Protein backbone atom coordinates (compact mmCIF):
# COMPACT_ATOMS: atom_id res chain seq x y z
CA UNK A 1 0.00 0.00 0.00
CA UNK A 2 2.34 2.13 1.38
CA UNK A 3 6.34 2.57 -0.17
CA UNK A 4 8.78 3.01 2.18
CA UNK A 5 12.78 4.40 1.56
CA UNK A 6 16.06 2.68 1.98
CA UNK A 7 18.14 5.44 0.79
CA UNK A 8 19.09 6.75 4.17
CA UNK A 9 22.90 8.50 2.47
CA UNK A 10 22.38 11.80 0.46
CA UNK A 11 25.22 12.07 -2.13
CA UNK A 12 28.45 13.22 -0.15
CA UNK A 13 26.03 14.73 2.16
CA UNK A 14 24.33 17.57 -0.31
CA UNK A 15 22.80 20.63 0.78
CA UNK A 16 21.02 21.10 4.03
CA UNK A 17 21.11 23.13 7.31
CA UNK A 18 24.38 22.21 9.00
CA UNK A 19 25.10 23.09 12.75
CA UNK A 20 28.57 23.67 13.41
CA UNK A 21 30.19 25.11 16.83
CA UNK A 22 28.74 28.09 16.50
CA UNK A 23 26.14 27.67 14.49
CA UNK A 24 22.98 27.01 14.94
CA UNK A 25 21.49 25.38 11.86
CA UNK A 26 23.26 26.94 8.88
CA UNK A 27 23.11 26.86 5.57
CA UNK A 28 26.00 24.89 4.45
CA UNK A 29 26.43 22.00 1.40
CA UNK A 30 28.77 19.29 1.55
CA UNK A 31 32.21 18.76 -0.01
CA UNK A 32 34.63 15.43 -0.52
CA UNK A 33 33.58 11.77 0.81
CA UNK A 34 35.78 9.58 2.50
CA UNK A 35 35.39 5.82 0.92
CA UNK A 36 37.77 5.37 -1.47
CA UNK A 37 40.18 2.95 -0.19
CA UNK A 38 41.05 5.35 2.48
CA UNK A 39 39.28 7.53 4.32
CA UNK A 40 41.34 9.29 7.21
CA UNK A 41 44.60 8.15 8.77
CA UNK A 42 43.31 7.17 12.42
CA UNK A 43 44.91 6.13 15.15
CA UNK A 44 48.02 4.70 12.94
CA UNK A 45 51.29 6.42 13.72
CA UNK A 46 54.16 7.57 11.24
CA UNK A 47 56.44 5.08 11.45
CA UNK A 48 59.07 7.16 9.88
CA UNK A 49 61.92 4.24 8.74
CA UNK A 50 65.15 5.78 9.51
CA UNK A 51 67.64 3.64 7.20
CA UNK A 52 65.14 2.92 3.90
CA UNK A 53 64.05 6.81 4.74
CA UNK A 54 60.44 5.59 3.88
CA UNK A 55 57.40 7.06 5.74
CA UNK A 56 54.84 4.08 7.08
CA UNK A 57 52.00 3.65 9.12
CA UNK A 58 52.07 1.32 11.83
CA UNK A 59 50.20 0.63 15.23
CA UNK A 60 51.42 0.18 18.51
CA UNK A 61 51.90 -3.69 18.60
CA UNK A 62 53.93 -3.10 14.82
CA UNK A 63 56.28 -1.15 17.23
CA UNK A 64 59.04 -3.24 19.26
CA UNK A 65 61.24 -0.86 21.86
CA UNK A 66 65.15 -1.60 21.35
CA UNK A 67 65.59 0.08 24.69
CA UNK A 68 64.87 -3.17 26.37
CA UNK A 69 64.31 -5.86 23.62
CA UNK A 70 67.51 -4.83 21.85
CA UNK A 71 68.74 -8.31 22.64
CA UNK A 72 65.87 -9.79 21.23
CA UNK A 73 66.03 -8.49 17.84
CA UNK A 74 69.37 -8.22 17.35
CA UNK A 75 70.00 -7.54 13.41
CA UNK A 76 67.94 -10.93 12.00
CA UNK A 77 68.79 -9.86 8.67
CA UNK A 78 71.70 -9.28 6.88
CA UNK A 79 71.40 -7.12 4.53
CA UNK A 80 73.64 -3.60 3.28
CA UNK A 81 70.74 -1.38 3.98
CA UNK A 82 69.69 -3.68 6.78
CA UNK A 83 72.62 -3.74 8.57
CA UNK A 84 73.86 -0.08 8.11
CA UNK A 85 70.96 1.21 9.43
CA UNK A 86 70.48 -1.30 12.53
CA UNK A 87 74.31 -0.42 13.28
CA UNK A 88 73.27 3.48 13.09
CA UNK A 89 70.66 2.32 15.57
CA UNK A 90 72.70 0.10 17.51
CA UNK A 91 74.66 3.03 18.66
CA UNK A 92 71.56 5.16 19.53
CA UNK A 93 71.54 7.63 22.21
CA UNK A 94 68.98 6.49 24.26
CA UNK A 95 70.35 3.67 25.49
CA UNK A 96 69.59 1.62 28.67
CA UNK A 97 72.22 -0.64 29.38
CA UNK A 98 73.52 -2.86 26.68
CA UNK A 99 72.84 -5.47 29.13
CA UNK A 100 69.54 -6.32 28.10
CA UNK B 1 49.38 17.75 35.52
CA UNK B 2 46.64 18.86 33.53
CA UNK B 3 43.62 16.44 35.21
CA UNK B 4 44.44 13.58 34.88
CA UNK B 5 47.62 11.82 32.96
CA UNK B 6 46.25 9.48 30.64
CA UNK B 7 47.93 9.65 27.59
CA UNK B 8 50.05 7.64 27.12
CA UNK B 9 50.89 6.74 23.21
CA UNK B 10 53.96 7.06 21.57
CA UNK B 11 55.43 10.01 21.92
CA UNK B 12 57.29 11.49 18.92
CA UNK B 13 60.91 11.06 19.22
CA UNK B 14 60.95 7.88 20.98
CA UNK B 15 62.50 4.96 18.55
CA UNK B 16 61.66 0.92 17.94
CA UNK B 17 61.72 -1.80 15.83
CA UNK B 18 59.03 -2.15 13.12
CA UNK B 19 57.39 -4.49 11.25
CA UNK B 20 56.76 -3.29 8.12
CA UNK B 21 56.03 -5.23 4.89
CA UNK B 22 59.52 -6.56 3.53
CA UNK B 23 60.76 -5.79 6.78
CA UNK B 24 60.61 -7.99 9.56
CA UNK B 25 62.04 -5.81 12.26
CA UNK B 26 63.67 -2.77 11.03
CA UNK B 27 64.53 0.35 13.71
CA UNK B 28 62.28 3.05 12.63
CA UNK B 29 61.59 6.71 14.30
CA UNK B 30 57.90 7.33 16.17
CA UNK B 31 56.31 10.48 14.74
CA UNK B 32 52.82 11.80 15.97
CA UNK B 33 49.81 12.01 13.64
CA UNK B 34 50.45 15.30 11.23
CA UNK B 35 47.41 16.93 12.19
CA UNK B 36 45.89 18.87 9.25
CA UNK B 37 42.23 17.58 8.79
CA UNK B 38 43.43 14.31 9.32
CA UNK B 39 44.41 13.13 12.51
CA UNK B 40 41.31 10.69 13.69
CA UNK B 41 37.99 10.71 12.59
CA UNK B 42 37.24 8.09 9.75
CA UNK B 43 33.72 9.15 8.28
CA UNK B 44 33.85 12.77 8.25
CA UNK B 45 32.55 14.98 5.87
CA UNK B 46 33.39 18.48 4.53
CA UNK B 47 31.29 21.15 4.68
CA UNK B 48 31.53 24.92 3.28
CA UNK B 49 29.60 27.50 5.06
CA UNK B 50 28.03 29.82 1.96
CA UNK B 51 27.60 32.60 5.60
CA UNK B 52 30.89 33.17 7.19
CA UNK B 53 32.43 31.65 3.75
CA UNK B 54 34.25 28.92 5.77
CA UNK B 55 35.35 24.95 5.48
CA UNK B 56 34.52 22.63 8.28
CA UNK B 57 33.98 19.44 9.40
CA UNK B 58 30.71 17.63 10.21
CA UNK B 59 29.00 14.55 10.32
CA UNK B 60 25.29 13.40 8.93
CA UNK B 61 24.08 13.79 12.55
CA UNK B 62 24.69 17.37 12.41
CA UNK B 63 23.32 17.87 8.53
CA UNK B 64 19.82 18.68 8.40
CA UNK B 65 17.19 17.79 5.80
CA UNK B 66 16.88 21.68 4.37
CA UNK B 67 13.46 21.48 2.41
CA UNK B 68 11.97 20.98 6.19
CA UNK B 69 13.90 23.16 7.92
CA UNK B 70 14.35 26.00 5.37
CA UNK B 71 10.66 26.37 6.55
CA UNK B 72 11.61 26.18 10.18
CA UNK B 73 14.54 28.45 10.75
CA UNK B 74 13.52 30.97 7.74
CA UNK B 75 14.82 33.77 9.57
CA UNK B 76 17.49 36.13 7.56
CA UNK B 77 18.98 39.41 7.79
CA UNK B 78 21.31 41.22 9.95
CA UNK B 79 23.38 38.11 8.91
CA UNK B 80 25.17 38.35 5.82
CA UNK B 81 26.49 35.21 4.77
CA UNK B 82 22.87 34.09 6.22
CA UNK B 83 20.69 36.06 3.53
CA UNK B 84 23.62 35.25 0.84
CA UNK B 85 23.49 31.51 1.40
CA UNK B 86 19.75 31.31 1.58
CA UNK B 87 19.77 32.90 -1.77
CA UNK B 88 22.45 31.55 -3.05
CA UNK B 89 20.60 28.38 -1.74
CA UNK B 90 16.54 28.87 -2.79
CA UNK B 91 17.88 29.87 -6.33
CA UNK B 92 20.35 27.41 -7.20
CA UNK B 93 19.60 24.36 -4.52
CA UNK B 94 20.11 21.48 -7.59
CA UNK B 95 22.30 23.58 -9.15
CA UNK B 96 20.21 24.58 -12.37
CA UNK B 97 22.70 23.55 -15.29
CA UNK B 98 19.29 21.93 -17.02
CA UNK B 99 16.46 23.25 -16.46
CA UNK B 100 17.00 27.17 -16.19
Same mark, same amino acid.
Given at each position: ?? @??? *? ?5 ? %?? +? ?9 ? =? #?? *????? #? ?5 ? $? ?8 ? %? $?? /? $??? +? %? #? ?12 ? %????? @????? /?? +? =? ?5 ? $? ?6
Amino acid at each position: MS @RSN *RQKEYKC %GD +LVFAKMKGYPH =W #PA *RIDEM #PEAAVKS $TANKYQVFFF %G $TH /E $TAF +L %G #PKDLFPYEESKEKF %GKPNK @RKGFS /EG +L =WEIENNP $TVKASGY
